[PDB]
Protein backbone atom coordinates (compact mmCIF):
# COMPACT_ATOMS: atom_id res chain seq x y z
CA UNK A 1 0.00 0.00 0.00
CA UNK A 2 2.65 2.60 0.98
CA UNK A 3 4.34 3.78 -2.21
CA UNK A 4 6.16 6.58 -3.99
CA UNK A 5 6.04 6.67 -7.75
CA UNK A 6 8.34 8.95 -9.74
CA UNK A 7 7.92 10.18 -13.29
CA UNK A 8 9.36 12.81 -15.61
CA UNK A 9 12.75 11.21 -16.40
CA UNK A 10 14.54 11.46 -19.74
CA UNK A 11 17.17 12.87 -22.06
CA UNK A 12 17.60 16.69 -22.06
CA UNK A 13 20.34 18.81 -23.63
CA UNK A 14 22.63 20.97 -21.48
CA UNK A 15 20.94 24.24 -20.51
CA UNK A 16 17.55 22.52 -20.71
CA UNK A 17 14.93 22.02 -18.03
CA UNK A 18 13.12 19.04 -16.67
CA UNK A 19 10.49 18.47 -14.04
CA UNK A 20 10.29 15.43 -11.80
CA UNK A 21 7.11 14.30 -10.06
CA UNK A 22 6.55 11.89 -7.19
CA UNK A 23 3.05 10.64 -6.25
CA UNK A 24 2.60 9.42 -2.70
CA UNK A 25 0.03 6.88 -1.54
CA UNK A 26 -0.92 4.68 1.39
CA UNK A 27 0.08 7.17 4.08
CA UNK A 28 -0.82 10.56 5.47
CA UNK A 29 1.11 12.65 2.95
CA UNK A 30 0.58 16.01 4.63
CA UNK A 31 2.47 14.90 7.80
CA UNK A 32 5.80 14.07 6.15
CA UNK A 33 8.80 15.96 4.81
CA UNK A 34 10.13 14.83 1.41
CA UNK A 35 13.44 14.94 -0.39
CA UNK A 36 15.28 14.05 -3.57
CA UNK A 37 18.53 12.05 -3.62
CA UNK A 38 20.57 11.18 -6.71
CA UNK A 39 23.21 8.70 -7.78
CA UNK A 40 25.36 9.43 -10.83
CA UNK A 41 26.93 6.64 -12.92
CA UNK A 42 29.47 4.75 -10.82
CA UNK A 43 28.97 7.30 -8.03
CA UNK A 44 27.42 7.22 -4.58
CA UNK A 45 24.35 8.78 -3.07
CA UNK A 46 24.08 12.59 -3.12
CA UNK A 47 21.56 14.66 -1.20
CA UNK A 48 19.77 17.06 -3.62
CA UNK A 49 16.86 18.75 -1.85
CA UNK A 50 14.30 18.48 0.93
CA UNK A 51 11.21 20.35 2.12
CA UNK A 52 9.20 19.96 5.31
CA UNK A 53 5.57 19.04 5.75
CA UNK A 54 4.06 22.41 4.80
CA UNK A 55 6.85 23.40 2.42
CA UNK A 56 7.90 26.35 4.57
CA UNK A 57 11.49 25.05 4.98
CA UNK A 58 13.19 23.94 1.75
CA UNK A 59 16.94 23.31 1.28
CA UNK A 60 19.41 22.27 -1.41
CA UNK A 61 22.68 20.50 -2.10
CA UNK A 62 25.50 22.96 -2.88
CA UNK A 63 25.88 21.76 -6.47
CA UNK A 64 22.21 22.40 -7.34
CA UNK A 65 21.38 25.52 -5.31
CA UNK A 66 19.73 28.07 -7.59
CA UNK A 67 19.00 25.73 -10.48
CA UNK A 68 16.73 23.22 -8.74
CA UNK A 69 13.44 23.96 -6.90
CA UNK A 70 11.47 21.52 -4.78
CA UNK A 71 7.72 22.00 -4.27
CA UNK A 72 4.73 20.05 -3.02
CA UNK A 73 0.97 19.81 -3.50
CA UNK A 74 -0.50 18.38 -0.31
CA UNK A 75 -3.95 18.29 -1.97
CA UNK A 76 -3.04 15.76 -4.67
CA UNK A 77 -0.07 14.13 -2.85
CA UNK A 78 2.70 15.21 -5.26
CA UNK A 79 6.19 16.45 -4.61
CA UNK A 80 8.11 17.97 -7.52
CA UNK A 81 11.63 18.80 -8.48
CA UNK A 82 12.04 21.58 -11.03
CA UNK A 83 15.49 21.26 -12.57
CA UNK A 84 16.77 24.13 -14.69
CA UNK A 85 20.02 24.93 -16.48
CA UNK A 86 20.93 21.27 -16.56
CA UNK A 87 24.60 20.14 -16.90
CA UNK A 88 26.30 16.87 -17.94
CA UNK A 89 27.24 16.36 -14.27
CA UNK A 90 23.51 16.29 -13.35
CA UNK A 91 23.19 12.94 -15.14
CA UNK A 92 21.98 10.44 -12.54
CA UNK A 93 19.22 8.27 -11.16
CA UNK A 94 16.95 10.57 -9.18
CA UNK A 95 15.05 9.19 -6.17
CA UNK A 96 12.03 10.75 -4.53
CA UNK A 97 12.03 9.93 -0.85
CA UNK A 98 9.76 10.26 2.20
CA UNK A 99 11.10 12.21 5.19
CA UNK A 100 10.04 12.13 8.88
CA UNK A 101 6.59 12.85 10.36
CA UNK A 102 8.00 14.90 13.26
CA UNK A 103 10.51 17.51 14.10
CA UNK A 104 12.20 18.91 17.14
CA UNK A 105 12.71 22.53 18.05
CA UNK A 106 15.86 24.24 19.45
CA UNK A 107 14.37 23.72 22.88
CA UNK A 108 14.30 19.98 22.37
CA UNK A 109 10.50 19.82 22.17
CA UNK A 110 9.31 17.17 19.72
CA UNK A 111 6.36 18.04 17.38
CA UNK A 112 4.37 14.97 16.23
CA UNK A 113 3.00 15.36 12.71
CA UNK A 114 5.27 18.23 11.61
CA UNK A 115 7.54 16.24 9.37
CA UNK A 116 10.86 17.29 7.88
CA UNK A 117 13.68 15.97 5.73
CA UNK A 118 16.40 14.78 8.07
CA UNK A 119 16.54 11.20 6.73
CA UNK A 120 14.43 9.05 4.43
CA UNK A 121 12.49 5.85 5.42
CA UNK A 122 10.61 5.20 2.12
CA UNK A 123 12.22 5.49 -1.35
CA UNK A 124 10.91 5.59 -4.93
CA UNK A 125 12.43 3.18 -7.48
CA UNK A 126 14.03 6.27 -9.04
CA UNK A 127 13.92 7.85 -12.50
CA UNK A 128 16.87 8.30 -14.87
CA UNK A 129 17.89 11.77 -16.09
CA UNK A 130 20.48 12.07 -18.86
CA UNK A 131 22.00 15.45 -19.79
CA UNK A 132 24.06 15.33 -22.96
CA UNK A 133 24.59 17.05 -26.27
CA UNK A 134 25.16 13.72 -28.00
CA UNK A 135 23.03 12.77 -30.99
CA UNK A 136 21.01 9.56 -30.96
CA UNK A 137 23.14 6.91 -32.73
CA UNK A 138 23.06 3.15 -33.29
CA UNK A 139 26.02 0.86 -32.40
CA UNK A 140 28.75 -0.65 -34.53
CA UNK A 141 28.93 -4.33 -33.63
CA UNK A 142 32.32 -5.94 -34.00
CA UNK A 143 33.16 -9.62 -33.38
CA UNK A 144 35.66 -10.60 -30.66
CA UNK A 145 37.21 -13.70 -32.24
CA UNK A 146 38.52 -16.81 -30.47
CA UNK A 147 42.13 -21.55 -24.26
CA UNK A 148 42.11 -20.75 -20.52
CA UNK A 149 40.37 -22.45 -17.58
CA UNK A 150 39.54 -25.14 -20.11
CA UNK A 151 37.45 -23.21 -22.64
CA UNK A 152 37.45 -20.72 -25.49
CA UNK A 153 35.88 -17.25 -25.30
CA UNK A 154 34.22 -14.96 -27.86
CA UNK A 155 32.00 -11.92 -27.89
CA UNK A 156 30.73 -8.76 -29.51
CA UNK A 157 32.01 -5.26 -29.06
CA UNK A 158 29.07 -2.92 -29.23
CA UNK A 159 30.62 0.48 -29.77
CA UNK A 160 29.60 4.16 -30.11
CA UNK A 161 25.86 4.23 -29.43
CA UNK A 162 23.63 6.83 -27.80
CA UNK A 163 21.64 6.74 -25.79
CA UNK A 164 21.59 3.71 -23.56
CA UNK A 165 20.52 1.14 -23.41
CA UNK A 166 21.34 -1.70 -25.78
CA UNK A 167 20.44 -5.34 -25.30
CA UNK A 168 22.52 -8.35 -26.31
CA UNK A 169 21.57 -11.98 -26.99
CA UNK A 170 23.47 -14.98 -28.35
CA UNK A 171 22.42 -17.42 -31.08
CA UNK A 172 18.94 -15.83 -31.07
CA UNK A 173 18.58 -16.06 -27.27
CA UNK A 174 18.73 -19.72 -26.30
CA UNK A 175 22.24 -19.24 -24.91
CA UNK A 176 22.45 -17.73 -21.41
CA UNK A 177 24.95 -20.05 -19.72
CA UNK A 178 28.32 -18.35 -19.34
CA UNK A 179 27.36 -15.06 -20.99
CA UNK A 180 28.63 -11.83 -19.42
CA UNK A 181 27.52 -8.46 -20.79
CA UNK A 182 29.53 -5.65 -19.23
CA UNK A 183 28.36 -2.31 -17.87
CA UNK A 184 28.54 0.43 -20.54
CA UNK A 185 31.38 2.93 -20.46
CA UNK A 186 30.89 6.50 -21.57
CA UNK A 187 33.80 7.36 -23.87
CA UNK A 188 35.45 10.80 -24.34
CA UNK A 189 33.34 11.16 -27.48
CA UNK A 190 30.23 11.16 -25.32
CA UNK A 191 29.08 7.87 -26.85
CA UNK A 192 28.76 4.59 -24.95
CA UNK A 193 30.55 1.29 -25.48
CA UNK A 194 30.46 -2.21 -24.02
CA UNK A 195 31.44 -5.81 -24.71
CA UNK A 196 29.36 -8.96 -24.46
CA UNK A 197 31.27 -12.21 -24.02
CA UNK A 198 30.65 -15.93 -23.56
CA UNK A 199 32.92 -18.86 -22.84
CA UNK A 200 32.49 -22.03 -24.99
CA UNK A 201 34.14 -25.44 -25.46
CA UNK A 202 37.27 -25.34 -27.68
CA UNK A 203 36.29 -28.56 -29.54
CA UNK A 204 32.85 -27.13 -30.31
CA UNK A 205 34.17 -24.06 -32.21
CA UNK A 206 34.17 -25.73 -35.64
CA UNK A 207 30.85 -27.52 -35.24
CA UNK A 208 28.66 -24.63 -34.03
CA UNK A 209 28.15 -21.07 -35.20
CA UNK A 210 27.97 -18.13 -32.78
CA UNK A 211 25.89 -14.99 -33.50
CA UNK A 212 25.13 -12.06 -31.20
CA UNK A 213 21.81 -10.28 -31.56
CA UNK A 214 22.17 -6.63 -30.62
CA UNK A 215 19.14 -4.40 -30.25
CA UNK A 216 19.24 -0.62 -29.77
CA UNK A 217 15.65 0.62 -29.83
CA UNK A 218 16.31 4.33 -29.20
CA UNK A 219 17.71 4.34 -32.74
CA UNK A 220 15.65 1.31 -33.80
CA UNK A 221 18.75 -0.67 -34.75
CA UNK A 222 19.05 -4.46 -34.88
CA UNK A 223 22.27 -6.22 -35.85
CA UNK A 224 23.39 -9.83 -35.86
CA UNK A 225 27.09 -10.73 -36.22
CA UNK A 226 28.87 -14.07 -36.66
CA UNK A 227 32.14 -14.68 -34.80
CA UNK A 228 34.66 -16.85 -36.66
CA UNK A 229 37.80 -18.40 -35.10
Amino acid sequence: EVQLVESGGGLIRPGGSLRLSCKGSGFIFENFGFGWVRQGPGKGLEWVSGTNWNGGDSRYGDSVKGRFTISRDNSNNFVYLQMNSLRPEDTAIYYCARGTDYTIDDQGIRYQGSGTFWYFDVWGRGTLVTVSSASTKGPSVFPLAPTSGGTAALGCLVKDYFPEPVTVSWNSGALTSGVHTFPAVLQSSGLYSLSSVVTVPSSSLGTQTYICNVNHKPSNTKVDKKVEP
Binding site: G44, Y119, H180
Partner: protein, 214 residues
Amino acid sequence: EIVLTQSPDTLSLSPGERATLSCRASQSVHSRYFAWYQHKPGQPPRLLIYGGSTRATGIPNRFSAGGSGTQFTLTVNRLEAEDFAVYYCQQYGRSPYTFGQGTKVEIRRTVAAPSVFIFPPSDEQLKSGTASVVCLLNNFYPREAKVQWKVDNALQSGNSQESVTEQDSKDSTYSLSSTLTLSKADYEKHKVYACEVTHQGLSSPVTKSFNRGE
Protein backbone atom coordinates in the same frame (compact mmCIF):
# COMPACT_ATOMS: atom_id res chain seq x y z
CA GLU B 1 30.05 21.61 4.48
CA ILE B 2 30.57 18.31 6.33
CA VAL B 3 32.40 15.60 4.45
CA LEU B 4 31.80 12.02 5.54
CA THR B 5 34.57 9.47 4.83
CA GLN B 6 33.73 5.82 5.26
CA SER B 7 36.18 2.99 5.84
CA PRO B 8 37.23 0.39 5.09
CA ASP B 9 36.36 0.66 1.37
CA THR B 10 35.27 -2.97 1.08
CA LEU B 11 34.83 -5.97 3.39
CA SER B 12 34.83 -9.64 2.23
CA LEU B 13 32.75 -11.53 4.74
CA SER B 14 30.52 -14.63 4.98
CA PRO B 15 27.08 -15.18 6.50
CA GLY B 16 27.28 -15.40 10.27
CA GLU B 17 30.26 -13.06 10.44
CA ARG B 18 30.17 -9.54 11.94
CA ALA B 19 30.64 -6.39 9.77
CA THR B 20 31.72 -3.10 11.35
CA LEU B 21 31.46 0.05 9.19
CA SER B 22 33.01 3.37 10.19
CA CYS B 23 32.31 6.94 9.12
CA ARG B 24 34.54 9.90 9.91
CA ALA B 25 32.91 13.39 9.80
CA SER B 26 35.10 16.39 8.93
CA GLN B 27 33.46 18.33 11.77
CA SER B 28 31.88 17.15 15.02
CA VAL B 29 28.25 16.04 14.66
CA HIS B 30 26.01 15.37 17.67
CA SER B 31 25.30 11.67 18.30
CA ARG B 32 21.59 11.93 17.42
CA TYR B 33 21.87 13.46 13.90
CA PHE B 34 23.10 10.46 11.97
CA ALA B 35 21.50 7.81 9.72
CA TRP B 36 22.63 4.71 7.82
CA TYR B 37 21.31 3.17 4.64
CA GLN B 38 21.77 -0.06 2.75
CA HIS B 39 21.67 -0.14 -1.03
CA LYS B 40 21.79 -3.12 -3.42
CA PRO B 41 22.06 -2.71 -7.19
CA GLY B 42 18.70 -2.31 -8.92
CA GLN B 43 16.75 -1.53 -5.75
CA PRO B 44 15.93 1.61 -3.80
CA PRO B 45 18.18 2.42 -0.82
CA ARG B 46 16.79 1.24 2.53
CA LEU B 47 16.93 3.15 5.86
CA LEU B 48 18.61 1.09 8.63
CA ILE B 49 19.35 3.53 11.47
CA TYR B 50 18.26 7.03 12.36
CA GLY B 51 18.89 9.26 15.40
CA GLY B 52 22.43 7.78 15.53
CA SER B 53 21.44 4.44 17.10
CA THR B 54 17.67 3.90 16.62
CA ARG B 55 16.63 0.97 14.33
CA ALA B 56 14.17 1.88 11.54
CA THR B 57 10.82 0.07 11.36
CA GLY B 58 11.21 -3.58 10.34
CA ILE B 59 14.98 -3.59 10.98
CA PRO B 60 16.10 -6.51 13.16
CA ASN B 61 18.23 -6.16 16.29
CA ARG B 62 21.32 -7.62 14.53
CA PHE B 63 21.91 -4.07 13.16
CA SER B 64 23.22 -1.55 15.71
CA ALA B 65 24.89 1.86 15.38
CA GLY B 66 26.25 4.70 17.44
CA GLY B 67 29.07 7.13 17.86
CA SER B 68 29.58 10.82 18.35
CA GLY B 69 31.93 13.66 17.50
CA THR B 70 33.85 12.72 14.38
CA GLN B 71 33.33 8.95 14.32
CA PHE B 72 30.16 6.98 13.80
CA THR B 73 29.81 3.23 13.35
CA LEU B 74 27.28 0.68 12.12
CA THR B 75 27.67 -3.00 13.09
CA VAL B 76 25.86 -5.93 11.46
CA ASN B 77 26.09 -8.56 14.21
CA ARG B 78 25.78 -11.72 12.07
CA LEU B 79 25.49 -11.24 8.28
CA GLU B 80 22.76 -12.91 6.13
CA ALA B 81 22.68 -12.92 2.23
CA GLU B 82 20.59 -9.77 1.83
CA ASP B 83 23.17 -7.92 3.86
CA PHE B 84 25.73 -8.02 1.08
CA ALA B 85 25.35 -4.56 -0.41
CA VAL B 86 26.75 -1.01 -0.18
CA TYR B 87 26.23 0.91 3.05
CA TYR B 88 26.15 4.70 3.38
CA CYS B 89 26.24 6.98 6.38
CA GLN B 90 24.40 10.29 6.35
CA GLN B 91 24.65 13.28 8.68
CA TYR B 92 21.81 15.73 9.36
CA GLY B 93 23.63 17.81 12.01
CA ARG B 94 24.18 20.65 9.56
CA SER B 95 22.81 21.67 6.15
CA PRO B 96 23.60 20.66 3.49
CA TYR B 97 22.93 17.15 4.64
CA THR B 98 25.55 14.79 3.15
CA PHE B 99 26.31 11.12 2.58
CA GLY B 100 29.53 9.12 2.97
CA GLN B 101 31.03 7.58 -0.21
CA GLY B 102 29.83 4.07 0.66
CA THR B 103 31.51 0.85 1.95
CA LYS B 104 30.84 -2.39 0.04
CA VAL B 105 30.25 -5.59 1.94
CA GLU B 106 30.74 -8.48 -0.53
CA ILE B 107 30.60 -12.25 -0.32
CA ARG B 108 33.81 -14.13 0.54
CA ARG B 109 34.30 -17.42 -1.40
CA THR B 110 37.19 -19.82 -2.23
CA VAL B 111 39.94 -18.43 -4.50
CA ALA B 112 39.22 -18.74 -8.24
CA ALA B 113 41.83 -17.74 -10.83
CA PRO B 114 40.59 -15.77 -13.87
CA SER B 115 40.37 -17.47 -17.24
CA VAL B 116 42.17 -14.87 -19.38
CA PHE B 117 41.59 -14.09 -23.06
CA ILE B 118 42.84 -11.43 -25.48
CA PHE B 119 40.97 -10.29 -28.60
CA PRO B 120 42.64 -8.23 -31.31
CA PRO B 121 40.83 -5.49 -33.27
CA SER B 122 38.44 -7.06 -35.83
CA ASP B 123 38.76 -6.53 -39.57
CA GLU B 124 35.38 -4.78 -39.56
CA GLN B 125 36.32 -2.19 -36.93
CA LEU B 126 39.62 -1.64 -38.69
CA LYS B 127 37.90 -1.01 -42.06
CA SER B 128 35.69 1.50 -40.26
CA GLY B 129 38.85 3.22 -38.98
CA THR B 130 39.08 2.51 -35.23
CA ALA B 131 41.10 -0.01 -33.13
CA SER B 132 40.09 -1.62 -29.79
CA VAL B 133 41.98 -4.43 -28.09
CA VAL B 134 40.05 -6.28 -25.38
CA CYS B 135 41.42 -8.35 -22.48
CA LEU B 136 38.84 -10.56 -20.67
CA LEU B 137 39.27 -11.90 -17.11
CA ASN B 138 36.49 -14.40 -16.54
CA ASN B 139 34.93 -15.73 -13.34
CA PHE B 140 37.52 -14.96 -10.70
CA TYR B 141 37.68 -14.27 -6.95
CA PRO B 142 38.79 -12.18 -5.08
CA ARG B 143 38.09 -8.89 -6.83
CA GLU B 144 41.60 -7.48 -6.76
CA ALA B 145 43.37 -8.01 -10.09
CA LYS B 146 46.03 -6.00 -11.83
CA VAL B 147 45.83 -5.79 -15.63
CA GLN B 148 48.74 -4.21 -17.52
CA TRP B 149 48.86 -3.59 -21.24
CA LYS B 150 52.08 -3.76 -23.27
CA VAL B 151 52.52 -2.78 -26.89
CA ASP B 152 55.83 -3.88 -28.37
CA ASN B 153 56.72 -4.31 -24.69
CA ALA B 154 56.16 -0.63 -23.87
CA LEU B 155 53.90 -0.42 -20.81
CA GLN B 156 50.65 1.45 -21.62
CA SER B 157 49.14 4.16 -19.44
CA GLY B 158 46.00 6.24 -19.72
CA ASN B 159 44.59 4.50 -22.78
CA SER B 160 42.61 1.67 -21.26
CA GLN B 161 39.36 1.38 -19.30
CA GLU B 162 38.15 -1.51 -17.12
CA SER B 163 34.55 -2.63 -16.70
CA VAL B 164 33.49 -5.20 -14.10
CA THR B 165 30.31 -7.16 -13.51
CA GLU B 166 28.46 -7.39 -10.22
CA GLN B 167 29.45 -10.34 -8.04
CA ASP B 168 27.72 -13.38 -9.61
CA SER B 169 24.49 -14.44 -7.80
CA LYS B 170 25.24 -18.16 -8.21
CA ASP B 171 28.98 -18.50 -7.84
CA SER B 172 30.05 -15.13 -6.26
CA THR B 173 32.73 -14.47 -8.84
CA TYR B 174 33.56 -11.37 -10.93
CA SER B 175 34.39 -10.94 -14.60
CA LEU B 176 36.26 -7.99 -15.98
CA SER B 177 37.13 -6.46 -19.35
CA SER B 178 40.05 -4.15 -20.01
CA THR B 179 39.82 -2.32 -23.28
CA LEU B 180 42.82 -0.65 -24.88
CA THR B 181 41.87 2.09 -27.34
CA LEU B 182 44.30 3.09 -30.11
CA SER B 183 44.13 5.07 -33.35
CA LYS B 184 44.29 2.71 -36.33
CA ALA B 185 47.46 4.53 -37.30
CA ASP B 186 49.19 3.56 -34.00
CA TYR B 187 47.84 0.03 -34.05
CA GLU B 188 49.46 -0.41 -37.44
CA LYS B 189 52.75 1.02 -36.11
CA HIS B 190 53.29 -1.83 -33.65
CA LYS B 191 53.49 -5.63 -33.64
CA VAL B 192 53.11 -7.36 -30.25
CA TYR B 193 50.10 -6.75 -28.02
CA ALA B 194 49.84 -8.16 -24.55
CA CYS B 195 47.64 -8.21 -21.49
CA GLU B 196 49.45 -9.23 -18.26
CA VAL B 197 47.23 -10.30 -15.33
CA THR B 198 48.24 -10.64 -11.65
CA HIS B 199 45.80 -12.32 -9.28
CA GLN B 200 45.77 -14.37 -6.06
CA GLY B 201 44.63 -17.56 -7.91
CA LEU B 202 47.61 -17.50 -10.31
CA SER B 203 50.98 -18.83 -9.16
CA SER B 204 52.53 -15.96 -11.16
CA PRO B 205 51.30 -13.28 -13.60
CA VAL B 206 49.74 -14.61 -16.80
CA THR B 207 50.32 -12.93 -20.16
CA LYS B 208 48.03 -13.35 -23.17
CA SER B 209 49.32 -11.81 -26.37
CA PHE B 210 49.16 -11.75 -30.13
CA ASN B 211 51.25 -10.45 -33.02
CA ARG B 212 49.36 -8.13 -35.30
CA GLY B 213 48.59 -9.99 -38.52
CA GLU B 214 49.40 -13.46 -37.22
